[PDB]
Amino acid sequence: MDDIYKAAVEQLTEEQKNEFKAAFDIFVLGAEDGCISTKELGKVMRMLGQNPTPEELQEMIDEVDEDGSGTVDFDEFLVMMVRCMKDDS
């Protein structure tokens, strides 16, 4: 197999990154170091038109947690966007 996600991230231009850096900021609005833990992520859901619980929110973080830390960062967060690039399944 290969890395269709880790490859796209590195192949991102300032046009895309400039967009991800936006949510990454509102995603950690109140964090201590600069990561996510649902407490900050869910805060956006209410505005996104939804509101997941703290027990399920972990799914949004465990979907890209390759470090076993629990919180997401510019590394795991970015991939979370490539996996949902466009819907065509």
């Binding site: 949510a23 956006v44 996104l48 996996r83």
Partner: peptide, 17 residues
Amino acid sequence: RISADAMMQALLGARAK
């Protein structure tokens, strides 16, 4: 899976007087 359309429409840009 993060509502790409409802993502910017809700936050990251919502100034409307």
